[PDB]
Design an enzyme around this catalytic site. Structure first.
Site, mmCIF file in Angstrom:
data_model
loop_
_atom_site.group_PDB
_atom_site.id
_atom_site.type_symbol
_atom_site.label_atom_id
_atom_site.label_comp_id
_atom_site.label_asym_id
_atom_site.label_seq_id
_atom_site.Cartn_x
_atom_site.Cartn_y
_atom_site.Cartn_z
ATOM 1 N N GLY A 127 0.814 -1.186 0.000
ATOM 2 C CA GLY A 127 0.000 0.000 0.000
ATOM 3 C C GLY A 127 0.846 1.233 0.000
ATOM 4 O O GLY A 127 0.541 2.235 -0.572
ATOM 5 N N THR A 128 2.032 1.210 0.642
ATOM 6 C CA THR A 128 2.977 2.238 0.578
ATOM 7 C C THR A 128 2.527 3.510 1.242
ATOM 8 O O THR A 128 2.801 4.605 0.751
ATOM 9 C CB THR A 128 3.353 2.569 -0.879
ATOM 10 O OG1 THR A 128 3.546 1.354 -1.613
ATOM 11 C CG2 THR A 128 4.643 3.374 -0.925
#
Lengths: 250, 223, 205, 204, 243, 245, 233, 245
Positions: free
Chosen positions: C9-10
């Site tokens: 998802g970062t």
């Protein structure tokens, strides 16, 4: 700073006998009764499960172990020696005949690995023999049904019936008489139960009795009813209830 | 290939197609992509043929060794973790894209594994060359209150989508139903939906055009 | 790296407040451009009071956290309960020693009752750094201004859930390797609360 | 130079009714120059036949490994190995040599002598197990060979008829090559008599 | 060889002197222990004797928390008890990572057993005399009580006791179990199990205990805890008003 | 102390013998008899199966007769257990000559590798030696049939007829008279049996207190067929020679 | 009995110490007599060297280990070499790694561990040779007594070797005098000669016999051997 | 004799082997150390015997540090004591690197504990002839532990070992009980000095030098220091007022 010891713990004596092995022959004698009958049409092995506190359970103990699915093994001698040996034996059978092959091991060939292990521990100091003698009962498609005996030295011999544990000679002698030629697996169970009854006294229950046959492999023993993809167990333990029915039927 | 796994509220279905190709020419109408690890832990594998099968036998061995040792059922999570540690050491050298499924006393489970080294847990998962077309069917038609008949029927539809739109996929479809309650069913060649590459007929060869330079016999022997 | 493109998802953060720490992340794995997983766990337990948020590459992070779980299971058992900073060291060791083959960006976030919540940020190269709040992933850069004004030492539990709910929903809106549900893990003296908000909910609030 | 196509070679196996047949060339080359009209790329240990095509150094080292493995196993069990068992033995040996730099295409052929099945099974460079019984081909010209077998072959054939098939199928695929001339042999196997027929064919 | 009084091997009587003496001294800590299972729980009650008033009681334990769910009671001398605890805790932790699953009582039992049998053969290394009682509330078989002894032997129990007053406790347990014909106490709530246990202990060793004389550990679903002094006192108090 | 458990029984004596070695020679005299007859047409091997129950099977006659290679076989006097460790190492020794030079191992070499190994254990390692003697029956086209024997000291010798086990001396004395330069296999089969009957430590003789094999030239191949006669096939042969009793 | 507790090094006896330690201790005394004295600015060692014969000659037993460090032995020559080699490596590393001249306290503790370790085996053994290890670093001059048991004491003067006590009692007397002679090479050398003579009672005091060694405030490790001790007699 | 006077490789009926019994003795022939736990700290104290006028003060001290907050003092044999702390130091240093934390006192205790237990299950590795009293202040509070040759350890409020161990513990349990725990770290130094004094009567043939140290949270601020100067002289003086033996 240690692990520099390798002088033997099994030596020759002046009768050329082996010290540890004489000692271990007793250990087998102080065991409990276990037998094997090969009916040709299968193999039946039975033993007494007995336990060392009244608060213990022998229903939650086991003295027959599965070595590979289609093969089960039993012993007379000392509990500790049996557990470590079964583990090592289960290890080599998987590694060397299902990663190098895929067919489950022929019986005799499995006996030769158990024998090699036990003798290896007798040669080399810093370990001592295992204090146990096995009857390893199996099935293989190219042998048929089989029965082998492994002695505490590491020696083996085939037998079509044998007995071990207290009153060994006398139990075995009883089998010779009651069973001749080829008779059924079913019939041989009826006999095995009687033979085991005469050795023991003060326990007669099916929660202290374990009888198992190698004699059929069902989808019910396969864990799936689909199209087979492996042989699966030919080992089957008969229930405590199942044992109880047959004692009444003597 | 197209390998899928689909959860229902009573069990899990995995399914695969069994076509191995060398070019467009069909080497094998049948090779199992569905491998048995233990009677109720079945694993589907995709990608390079040699790699998925070998890894699956090493693990397959270590899990059976485990089951006997503990005198208890094998867990799906043991097989999972063995697979992950094996990929990790070899840093991707194993090129196995796996869909590991199992039923235990803990319930029915469905995970998938990339060769890249990541694992995921899903309600339905798919992998393969047919992965996009199949995952599309499975997310759309999966629903709460899924059952056995609905889960087989969905599973047939999945493999079929991948057959049709990936034409490196084709041939028989093998399905395996694993229920918590009842003894698992491996359904070999549950559907026989596509056939062999093209033939024109062939016919007998005249013996005035097939000639032998010399011949002998010999015999097989064993001491 | 290990092998190929694995991505997550970062956008992760851990934030401190009056009762402890709330860590939040979005959950989504993609393998190229194929959506390997809608909803996953990037809020990973390594001890009951000590969790982490994972960023970097999904595989790498998972191997490394496995190893962490193993060392603290052993640390707990022999040497007693570990700090956030202690959890953070094991992470750092791995990250530094394997920077030449793995990329792992870890926020180790923990609640203790005798020093309150603590937030430790582990670089890709492997380092141990203390802050009152941290933002990491690469969508953390666009909410840096936001986080820095609207973070305050001391806030209510509802309110912290809004701050983290607002922060990440902006990150997921501009970012393209993010999506799926929002997960949170509240480590308080009221227990471990796991929060899930579904796509429709965070977009709106 | 080439990985496996220095000396070339191609191999064909077919299924019938209580017979199988396995056939090979006899080429050995050194690049595109054919050197020799003899080189036997099929070996057998008892009633299991193993053809391995590819680079000769690698076919030889493997052949001696399987001879070893089988001999010592034969000695312990007091009987020969079975087609079915040998396919297992091969997969694993090859999976041990995937990491090593071998360049081989084995194909396994035999008839089970107490289960009464024709048996053929295949192996590759990767060393994956191929269960099919119709034809399996391997070698340089494997692409031409599948096209040909798949049209020419018809299921379940008597030995004579299996011979006409295998022979022509090989001979015509071979004629589109220069890496598969320099003579050829065909073996027709039953588990109690083997006929060897040499063919007369093209070279460069 | 020619030696058995300096190294360890099979006896011709068949009763190995080193194993027998290991059976004997373990009692050098002045302990007596039991563990029972309730329907849902497994309770251990254990003695503590404090031999100085330069000693704190709260660092004195014979129960070591292996994992999060698994408990272990060691009856032995404490340097040997701890040696086993260190080894058991790591093997448990190693298993949990590798196999994704928390260690079984029986498997921990079996593994430490097989190792002690290995040390028994060894001529350069001695066996620990420790008697290890592994307990938990597994959800894959319920409550479980499994006891090892230094030999390599282990077997499953219905409830167990250790110490020289093993027989006396045994009888108290046998009587209860014959009467109900069940191998467990079916009392809902752990509490009532701990109190019952405490009654039977007071009968066997025939003395009233104090908060600082018992140490009580209870195993619950998916979590294991030792109980505190203040709580232990609540138990002793409440049985004084049944007659 | 480590050396305060050592007894050093692996060393030369004040008589210059090795304790453990001398004890192994003894072992071999308490195990069954094994007899080797080499003829120039075959090799006849017998080994005596002692302690024979009726619930011991008679479907096995490979359990002291072992093929080490497909032209070399042995008869064991000693234990199954000692032998087995060496037997596996022999079989391996076979495959090494075979893989490298693509031809059959010589007997004379293969014997030497076993003896050197036995010798090794009593010099170094602190080990027991193996309590086993082998009589080796094998064929070469550089020497015809060769027949060797190796024993627990690591000493090995060639014989053209040999006995080992219980009553060695007595068997050998009978052997020396009945021996003749001229040979055939079927003549050697009669010879072995006449002797075997007179060396038994039990009255008369029966087929089951024997294990038997012959080495004839061909019977399903060009030459060199090892045939191990199973108990019932031995029963027939005791009548054929005319030792029907 | 005796043979139980000599024949093993991984034992102990009822006294609180093994017999082998008693014999190793005896062995230091079997050395030839040497005194050591310092005022804590300079440290001197004065040593009586005996040689076997009129046809033997003297061989060195004062060992330069660095140009600021040394030792004398008393006891077993074979062992003394082993220890000296160790201290020398140890001196070298201290210079390369830390820029240090090595304190006696740090060196002693390290020599101790090795000694301990060889009683933690069969076929290792205590050294059975003692050393007076001197050096001049930044906390001044230092004199240590090392024993192969692992007992490390720093003393202001001491002796080891046969009839240690003779010099030692002379030293406890002259103590207060020598410690306030600070900064003098020559006054302390003269003292050493005077000291060693209170040891003697069955041996001669001669130029070639005696040997002097110094390190100190303005002296890196320099030995006076043979001829060059005559002018301090 | 029983054979267990020189073996650690077998089990004895005393629950422990005679050679471990012999190491305990060696502890009792060293010179007195105590440990005083406080409500803010811990205090260590040692007797060092003066026999000769040649000794130098506080460089031959038997108090050694591990890290900078952990105090270790022992009685019995000198080489065994140094070896022990030297191992503790390596393992501590390993801990410090790996977990980036100072060591806990209960953790350090285990780290030593397994090393001390290991050389009693091995015949080839010598027991310790020291009993070591150690403790400090950490992030869990202050802790005093004492470790025996056995591998035995437990948590203390006061602890003693060496010749005057009995006498010393008697005075100590009385004072520790009469107070809450021996009040604060300053008070404890005067009391400690009095114990070292009383203890010297069990040793009054040779003189002593009293050497005291501390690591106290509230009066040394988390570091270990020796207690010296004005304060050490002051404490001897205080003792000589009340006790005048």
């Amino acid at each position: 700073m240690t692990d520099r010891y390798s002088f033997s713990l099994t030596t020759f004596s002046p009768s050329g006998k082996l010290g540890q092995i004489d000692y271990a022959l007793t250990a087998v004698k102080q065991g409990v009764t276990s037998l094997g009958i090969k009916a040709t049409n299968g193999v039946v092995i039975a033993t007494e499960k007995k336990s060392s506190s009244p608060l213990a359970m022998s229903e939650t103990l086991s003295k027959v172990s599965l070595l590979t699915p289609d093969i089960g093994a039993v012993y007379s001698g000392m509990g500790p020696d049996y557990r470590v040996l079964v583990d090592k034996s289960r290890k080599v059978a998987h590694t060397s005949y299902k990663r190098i092959y895929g067919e489950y091991p022929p019986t005799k060939l499995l006996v030769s690995e158990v024998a090699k292990i036990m003798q290896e521990a007798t040669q080399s100091g810093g370990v001592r023999p295992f204090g146990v003698s096995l009857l390893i009962a199996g099935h293989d498609e190219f042998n048929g049904f089989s029965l082998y005996q492994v002695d505490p030295s590491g020696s083996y011999f085939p037998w079509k019936a044998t007995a071990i544990g207290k009153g060994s000679v006398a139990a075995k002698t009883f089998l010779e008489k009651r069973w001749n030629d080829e008779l059924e697996l079913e019939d041989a169970i009826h006999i095995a139960l009687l033979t085991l009854k005469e050795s023991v006294e003060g326990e007669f229950n099916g929660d202290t009795i374990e009888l198992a046959i190698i004699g059929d492999e069902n989808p019910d023993l396969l864990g799936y009813t689909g199209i087979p993809t492996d042989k699966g167990p030919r080992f089957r333990k008969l229930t405590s209830q199942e044992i109880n029915d047959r004692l009444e039927a003597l | 290939t197209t390998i899928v796994g689909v959860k229902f509220n009573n069990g899990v279905v995995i399914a695969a197609d069994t076509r191995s190709t060398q070019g467009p020419i069909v080497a094998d109408k049948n090779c199992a992509k569905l491998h048995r690890i233990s009677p109720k832990i079945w694993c589907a594998g995709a990608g390079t043929a040699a790699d998925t099968e070998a890894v699956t036998q090493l693990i397959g061995s270590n899990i059976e060794l485990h089951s006997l040792y503990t005198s208890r059922e094998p867990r799906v999570v043991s097989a999972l973790q063995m697979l992950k540690q094996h990929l990790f050491k070899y840093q991707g050298h194993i090129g196995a894209y796996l869909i590991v499924a199992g039923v235990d006393p803990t319930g029915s489970h469905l995970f998938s594994i990339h060769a890249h080294g990541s694992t995921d847990v899903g309600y339905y998962l798919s992998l393969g060359s047919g992965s996009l077309a199949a995952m599309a069917v499975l997310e759309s038609h999966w629903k709460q209150d899924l059952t056995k008949e609905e889960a087989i029927k969905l599973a047939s539809d999945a493999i079929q989508a991948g057959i049709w739109n990936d034409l490196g996929s084709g041939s028989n479809v093998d399905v395996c139903v694993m229920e918590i309650g009842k003894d698992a069913e491996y359904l070999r060649n549950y559907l026989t939906p596509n056939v062999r590459e093209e033939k024109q007929k062939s016919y007998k060869f005249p013996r005035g055009t097939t000639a032998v330079l010399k011949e002998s016999i010999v015999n097989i022997c064993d001491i | 790296l290990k092998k190929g493109e694995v991505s997550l998802g970062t956008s992760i953060m851990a934030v401190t407040f009056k009762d402890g720490v709330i860590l939040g992340a979005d959950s989504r794995t993609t393998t190229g451009a194929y959506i390997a997983n809608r909803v996953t766990d990037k809020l990973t337990r390594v001890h009951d009071k000590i969790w982490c948020c994972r960023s970097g590459s999904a595989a790498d992070t998972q191997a490394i956290a496995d190893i962490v779980q193993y060392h603290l299971e052993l640390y707990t058992s022999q040497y007693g309960t570990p700090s956030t900073e202690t959890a953070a060291s094991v992470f750092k060791e791995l990250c530094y020693e394997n920077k030449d083959n793995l990329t792992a960006g870890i926020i180790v976030a923990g609640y203790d009752d005798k020093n309150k919540g603590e937030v430790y940020t582990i670089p890709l190269g492997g380092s141990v750094h203390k802050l009152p709040y941290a933002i990491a992933g690469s969508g953390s850069t666009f909410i840096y201004g936001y986080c820095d004004k609207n973070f305050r030492e001391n806030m209510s539990k509802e309110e912290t859930v809004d701050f983290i709910k607002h922060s990440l929903s902006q990150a997921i809106k501009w970012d393209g390797s993010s999506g799926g549900v929002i997960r949170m893990v509240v480590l308080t003296a009221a227990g471990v609360e796991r929060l899930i908000f579904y796509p429709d909910e965070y977009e709106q609030l | 130079s080439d990985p496996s196509s220095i000396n070339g070679g191609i191999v064909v196996a077919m299924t019938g009714k209580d017979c199988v047949a396995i056939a090979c060339d006899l080429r050995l080359g050194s690049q595109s120059l054919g050197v020799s009209n003899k080189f036997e790329k099929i070996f057998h240990y008892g009633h299991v036949f193993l053809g391995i095509t590819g680079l000769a150094t690698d076919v030889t080292t493997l052949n001696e490994m399987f001879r070893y493995k089988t001999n010592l196993y034969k000695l312990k069990e007091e009987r020969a190995i079975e087609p079915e068992t040998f396919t297992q033995l091969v997969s694993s040996s090859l999976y041990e040599r995937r990491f090593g730099p071998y360049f081989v295409g084995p194909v396994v052929a035999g008839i089970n002598s107490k289960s009464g099945k024709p048996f053929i099974a295949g192996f590759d460079l990767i060393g994956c197990i191929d269960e099919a019984k119709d034809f399996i081909v391997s070698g340089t010209a494997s692409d031409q060979l599948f096209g040909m077998c798949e049209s020419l072959y018809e299921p379940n054939l008597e030995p004579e008829d299996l011979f006409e098939t295998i022979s022509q199928a090989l001979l015509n695929a071979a004629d589109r090559d220069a890496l598969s001339g320099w003579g050829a042999v065909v073996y027709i196997i039953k588990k109690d008599e083997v006929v060897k027929r040499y063919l007369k064919m093209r070279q460069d | 060889a020619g030696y058995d009084r300096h190294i360890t091997i099979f006896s011709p009587e068949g009763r190995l002197y080193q194993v027998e003496y290991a059976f004997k001294a373990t009692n050098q800590t002045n302990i007596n222990s039991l563990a029972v299972r309730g329907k849902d729980c497994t309770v251990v009650i254990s003695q503590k004797k404090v031999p100085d008033k330069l000693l704190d009681p709260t660092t004195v334990s014979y129960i070591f928390c292996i994992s999060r769910t698994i408990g272990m009671v060691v009856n032995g001398p404490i340097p040997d008890a701890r040696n086993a605890a260190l080894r058991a805790k790591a093997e448990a932790a190693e298993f949990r990572y590798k196999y994704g699953y928390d260690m079984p009582c029986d498997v921990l039992a079996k593994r430490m057993a097989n190792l002690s049998q290995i040390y028994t053969q060894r001529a350069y290394m001695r066996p620990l005399g420790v008697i290890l009682t592994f307990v938990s509330v597994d959800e894959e078989l319920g409550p479980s009580i499994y006891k090892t002894d230094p030999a390599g032997y282990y077997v499953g129990y219905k409830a167990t006791a250790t110490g020289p007053k093993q027989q006396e406790i045994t009888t108290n347990l046998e009587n209860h179990f014959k009467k109900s014909k069940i191998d467990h106490i079916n009392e809902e709530s752990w509490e009532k199990v701990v109190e019952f246990a405490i009654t039977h202990m007071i009968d066997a060793l025939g003395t009233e205990f104090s908060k600082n004389d018992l140490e009580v550990g209870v195993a619950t679903k998916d979590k294991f805890f030792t109980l505190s002094a203040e709580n232990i006192e609540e138990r002793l108090v409440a049985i004084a008003e049944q007659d | 102390g480590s050396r305060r458990y050592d007894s050093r029984t692996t060393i030369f004596s004040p008589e210059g013998r090795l304790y453990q070695v001398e004890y192994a020679l003894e072992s071999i005299s308490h195990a069954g008899t094994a007899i080797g007859i080499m003829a120039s047409d075959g090799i006849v091997l017998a080994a005596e199966r002692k302690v024979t129950s009726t619930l011991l099977e008679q479907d096995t006659s490979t359990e002291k007769l072992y093929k080490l290679n497909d032209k070399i076989a042995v008869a064991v006097a000693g234990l199954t257990a000692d032998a087995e460790i060496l037997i596996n190492t022999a079989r391996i020794h076979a495959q090494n000559y075979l893989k490298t030079y693509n031809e059959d191992i010589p007997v004379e070499i293969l014997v030497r590798r076993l003896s050197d190994i036995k010798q090794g254990y009593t010099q170094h390692g602190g080990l027991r030696p193996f309590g086993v003697s082998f009589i080796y029956a094998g064929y070469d086209d550089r020497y015809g049939y060769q027949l060797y024997t190796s024993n627990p000291s690591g000493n090995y010798t060639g014989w053209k007829a040999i006995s080992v086990g219980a009553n060695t001396s007595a068997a050998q004395t009978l052997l020396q008279m009945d021996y003749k330069d001229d040979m055939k296999v079927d003549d050697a089969i009669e010879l072995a049996l006449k002797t075997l009957s007179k060396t038994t430590d039990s009255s008369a003789l029966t087929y089951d207190r024997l294990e038997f094999a012959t080495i004839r030239k061909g019977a399903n191949d060009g030459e060199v067929y090892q045939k191990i006669f199973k108990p019932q096939e031995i029963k027939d042969i005791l009548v054929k020679t005319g030792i029907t009793k | 009995f005796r043979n139980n507790y000599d024949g093993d090094t991984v034992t102990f006896s009822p006294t609180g110490r093994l017999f082998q330690v008693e014999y190793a201790l005896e062995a230091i005394k079997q050395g030839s007599v040497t005194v050591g004295l310092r005022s804590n600015t300079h440290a001197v060692l004065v040593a009586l060297k005996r040689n076997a014969d009129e046809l033997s000659s003297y061989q060195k037993k004062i060992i330069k280990c660095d140009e600021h460090m040394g030792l004398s032995l008393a006891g077993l020559a074979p062992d003394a070499r082993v220890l000296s080699n160790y201290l020398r490596q140890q001196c070298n590393y201290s210079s390369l790694v830390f820029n240090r001249k090595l304190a006696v306290e740090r060196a002693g503790h390290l020599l101790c561990d090795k000694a301990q370790k060889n009683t933690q085996s069969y076929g290792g053994r205590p050294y059975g040779v003692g050393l007076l290890i001197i050096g001049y670093d930044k906390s001044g001059a230092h004199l240590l007594e090392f024993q192969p048991s692992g007992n490390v004491t720093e003393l202001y003067g001491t002796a080891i070797g046969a009839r240690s006590q003779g010099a030692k009692t002379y030293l406890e007397r002259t103590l207060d005098t020598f410690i306030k002679i600070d900064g003098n090479p020559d006054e302390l050398i003269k003292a050493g000669v005077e000291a060693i003579s209170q040891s003697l009672r069955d041996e001669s005091l001669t130029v070639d016999n005696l040997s002097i060694a110094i390190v100190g405030k303005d002296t890196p490790f320099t030995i006076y051997d043979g001829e060059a001790v005559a002018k301090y007699i | 004799g029983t054979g267990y006077d020189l073996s650690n490789s077998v089990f004895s009926p005393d629950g422990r082997n005679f050679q471990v019994e012999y190491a305990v003795k060696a502890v009792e022939n060293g010179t007195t150390s105590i440990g005083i736990k406080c409500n803010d700290g811990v205090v260590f104290a040692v007797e060092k015997l003066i026999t000769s006028k040649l000794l130098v003060p506080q460089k031959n001290v038997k108090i050694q540090v591990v890290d900078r907050h952990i105090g270790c003092v022992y009685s019995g044999l000198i080489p065994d004591g140094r070896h022990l702390v030297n191992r503790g130091r390596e393992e501590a240093a390993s801990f410090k690197k790996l977990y980036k934390t100072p060591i806990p006192i209960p953790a350090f205790a285990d780290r030593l504990g397994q090393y001390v237990q290991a050389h009693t299950l091995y015949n080839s590795v010598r027991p310790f002839g020291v009993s070591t009293i150690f403790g400090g202040v950490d992030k869990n509070g202050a802790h005093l532990y004492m470790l025996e040759p056995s591998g035995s350890y437990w948590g203390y409020k006061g602890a003693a070992t060496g010749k005057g161990r009995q006498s010393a513990k008697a005075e100590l349990e009385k004072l520790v009980d009469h107070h809450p725990e021996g009040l604060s770290a300053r008070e404890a130094v005067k009391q400690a000095a009095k114990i070292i004094y009383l203890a010297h009567e069990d040793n009054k043939e040779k003189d002593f030098e009293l050497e005291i140290s501390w690591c106290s949270l509230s009066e040394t601020n988390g570091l270990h220091k020796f207690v010296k100067g004005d304060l050490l002289q002051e404490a001897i003086d205080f003792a000589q007022k009340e006790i005048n033996g």
